[PDB]
Amino acid sequence: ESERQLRLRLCVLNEILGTERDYVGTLRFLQSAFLHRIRQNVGLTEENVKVLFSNIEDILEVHKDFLAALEYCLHPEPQSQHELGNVFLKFKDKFCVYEEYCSNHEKALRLLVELNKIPTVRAFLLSCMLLGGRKTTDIPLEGYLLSPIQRICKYPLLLKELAKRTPGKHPDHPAVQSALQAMKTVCSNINETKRQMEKLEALEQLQSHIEGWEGSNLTDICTQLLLQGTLLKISAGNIQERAFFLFDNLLVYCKRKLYIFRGRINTEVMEVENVEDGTADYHSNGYTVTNGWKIHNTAKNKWFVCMAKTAEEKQKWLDAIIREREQRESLKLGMERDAYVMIAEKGEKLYHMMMNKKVNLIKDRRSTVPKCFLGNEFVAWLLEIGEISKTEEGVNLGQALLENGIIHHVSDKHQFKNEQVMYRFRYDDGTY
């Protein structure tokens, strides 16, 4: 099985590199979309930025060199002979940059909650993420502000797995084990990361007590266990008692023996339905249901019935299941509502701003095309007027206007580009 422990090591190496790359990119997005753009065109005060982002720029400079040494050891590719323990050890002292950030984290969130109450500041914050390239309906800024705390806690989890796939023969063995101990002591010193590490430890401890795990690791999809309990899975032809675990974003049912993995469901495709005590239907295999409900895997269009011992447990479960749905569905729908309002606002604003003869850009050009403007001119005018800083920001803005039904190509055959492609506001041609 030596080759098994080999490909397994490379997967760890490939992951450490690929995840570190996406981390630095996330840091490089936070400064360009936020810290840099406001430090140029000076409703977000300077103190507001210092509170929200703290030393995120110092964290970047550290991880910009970490990634270099990571790619340095893993050149030309992630090869098994390559050693990575020394890298973590010679950056172990530089990781104290997380001290100030994790301290200011609570204060930053408190500010963000009050800033999001102001509609103009919420829109500006969301406008920064749009211009920076990243989608606004995906991860909220609260999550971006936390990813430093998450990343520094993902290092012990990654090094542990690497140490498992690294034999005592490999010269990196004394270093990987020494680096794992050092990375743990880093997180343990900081209070904010200590709470995070113990929350990730719980997810991984549970996954270790489950045999035959299939799918993505809990530490990569969930954050906390919501409810655990043993129920009856009256699936078609299989009425067996199962141990159910409800996390955020995932539900998994196991076979109690420690547990043995049986199946898992993503809560996004899960739809529950109550069955009154005394009901008997096909999903219950004909048996009378008491203190039970019904689950529907809308991905597979499969229904299966759960039953609890007490009616308290039924309510305890049904209540916890509804909460998870509402919590994530409110966030998602909320980010998607607060993002349409800024585009509609900026769309109507830039329309009237462009209609004035000071910078007339929606001119009837030529067959004649009425009330059209040029993408090249539009992007340039945005930088002149100061609404954007880079040109990549201008196309990201125009595309968001095209996608959100504000503008469109004259022939609806092109997306937004910095070329002299003619676009028109959907107001002028009655398509709004």
Author numbering: 42 to 83, 90 to 304, 467 to 575, 579 to 644
What did the original publication write about this model?
P-Rex1 and its close homolog P-Rex2 are highly conserved GEFs that activate Rho GTPases (Rac1, Cdc42, RhoG) to coordinate cytoskeletal organization and cell motility. P-Rex1 is a 186 kDa multidomain-containing protein with an N-terminal catalytic DH domain, a PI(3,4,5)P3-binding PH domain, tandem Dishevelled, Egl-10 and Pleckstrin domain (DEP) domains, tandem PDZ domains and a phosphoinositide-4-phosphatase domain (IP4P).
Nevertheless, in a breakthrough, splicing T4 lysozyme (T4L) into the unstructured β3–β4 loop of the PH domain and deleting the first N-terminal 40 residues resulted in diffracting crystals and a final 3.2 Å P-Rex1 DH-PH-DEP1 structure. In the crystal structure, the DH-PH-DEP1 domains form a closed triangular topology with the DH domain intercalated into a groove formed by the PH and DEP1 domains and an extended PH-DEP1 linker helix. In the autoinhibited structure, the final DH domain α6-helix is broken into two halves at residue Ile237, forming a closed helix–turn–helix hinge. The closed hinge enables the DEP1 domain to interact with the DH domain, forming a DEP1 latch that further stabilizes the closed conformation. Hinge opening results in rotation of the DH domain away from the PH domain—this transition enables GTPase binding and activation. At the DH domain hinge region, the conserved hinge α6-helix closes back on the main body of the DH domain, burying Thr240 in a cleft formed by DH domain helices α3 and α5. The conserved α4-helix residues Leu177 and Leu178 bury a combined surface area of around 200 Å2.
